[PDB]
Amino acid sequence: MNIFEMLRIDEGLRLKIYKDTEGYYTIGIGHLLTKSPSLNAAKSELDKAIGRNTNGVITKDEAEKLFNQDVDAAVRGILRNAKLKPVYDSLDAVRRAALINMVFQMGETGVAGFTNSLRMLQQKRWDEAAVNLAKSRWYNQTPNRAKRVICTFRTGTWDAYK
Numbered sequence: 423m424n425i426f427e428m429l430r431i432d433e434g435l436r437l438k439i440y441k442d443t444e445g446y447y448t449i450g451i452g453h454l455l456t457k458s459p460s461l462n463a464a465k466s467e468l469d470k471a472i473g474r475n476t477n478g479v480i481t482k483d484e485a486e487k488l489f490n491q492d493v494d495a496a497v498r499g500i501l502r503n504a505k506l507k508p509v510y511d512s513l514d515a516v517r518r519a520a521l522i523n524m525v526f527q528m529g530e531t532g533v534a535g536f537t538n539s540l541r542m543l544q545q546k547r548w549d550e551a552a553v554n555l556a557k558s559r560w561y562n563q564t565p566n567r568a569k570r571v572i573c574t575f576r577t578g579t580w581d582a583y584k
């Protein structure tokens with residue numbers, strides 16, 4: 423298991439524009455296009471991201487290219503962030519994947535707001551961090567996925583995903 427397979431499991435793969443759990447226009451492997459309610463705005467974003475006139479449908483190769491870029495961006499967002507970098511640096515390789523998963527889903531700003539959870543992770547208080555992590559809009563809106571990411575933080579294994 424690795425971060426790409428992990429996020430592939432959580433985000434799925436759709437080759438046509440769809441609405442994510444929040445109702446936002448999205449495509450491929452959880453690639454957010456826009457928060458605007460306009461399908462045309464979304465198609466325009468898609469054409470721009472892919473570099474061709476798509477009409478809302480992309481290929482698997484294109485979905486995967488967007489995915490590669492998004493994972494790379496998430497990782498680099500963490501490394502450039504002053505609240506996130508220290509936590510990442512302190513974690514083992516499995517739990518690092520968990521952090522990348524959160525950032526991928528809710529953004530660098532969003533994760534950096536889990537101030538208390540981040541401090542417990544740095545101290546390696548896994549059970550305590552798990553409980554604090556569950557007290558969140560994130561957990562209540564997407565329980566199954568949050569559970570998987572939280573269990574990963576708690577155990578340091580890939581068991582939530584096998």
Ligand SMILES: *SCC1=CC(C)(C)N(O)C1(C)C
Pocket residue numbers: 572573574576577
């Ligand atoms: S999060 C899943 C999990 C963690 C731990 C506390 C080690 N468990 O006993 C289960 C398998 C419930």
Ligand SMILES: [Cl-]
Pocket residue numbers: 563564565566567568
């Ligand atoms: Cl879910």
